[PDB]
Amino acid sequence: MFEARLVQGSILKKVLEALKDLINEACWDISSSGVNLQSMDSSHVSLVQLTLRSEGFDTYRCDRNLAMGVNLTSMSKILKCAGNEDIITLRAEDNADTLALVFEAPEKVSDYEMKLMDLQLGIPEQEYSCVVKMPSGEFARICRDLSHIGDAVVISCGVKFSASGELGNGNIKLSQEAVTIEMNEPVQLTFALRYLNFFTKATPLSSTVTLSMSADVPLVVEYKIADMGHLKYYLAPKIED
């Protein structure tokens, strides 16, 4: 039997708004330490790692670990029925065919049962040659803007984001609310803006975002969820033929 009460239910709403358009079916790893979700996107170019630590919940209980296969869109739909200031409680039993979502308004209580599905990849140890901390909104604006220019962004790290298409090209230069760069080596990597634009759907989770880079390894776009944990996207690079 698992039960997690969250008073800032908006967090879970924002989380699933961030994931629904990138992963169809994903397994939620529920443990005593908290909720874990790790899933490739449907395109097999990225890896999402979500961590909500038990501490971040207002009450949290998980007698035995449980892996709930979840259709993220259906869970998205159910969470759109939660008031943006509702108290969300998650509730599962062992061998559950169903995850219970209870939305308490601060005299309306909504009880949802979501049918669970029956449903692998390891994150290596990596020192990142370059790590960029910047406002999440600015990063989303960059990846939105450059997608009008091209399909690919070359990230050069001062960090430069450059795209080119038929109409021309664009270079966006940020240097050091704040933007900070820890650079142990200069890196230049190319990534599909389409997937970075999926990642920035997590922008409501945090005012800032961190981009971790290293030569010829996946890019890490990390959105920390204040207190609870984080939402991490790893994006396989584009490589020159």
Partner: peptide, 13 residues
């Protein structure tokens, strides 16, 4: 330039 799969970078146990 060509997109690569995340599984061509990350592995399983």
């Amino acid at each position: 330039t060509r997109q690569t799969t995340i599984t061509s970078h990350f592995a399983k146990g």
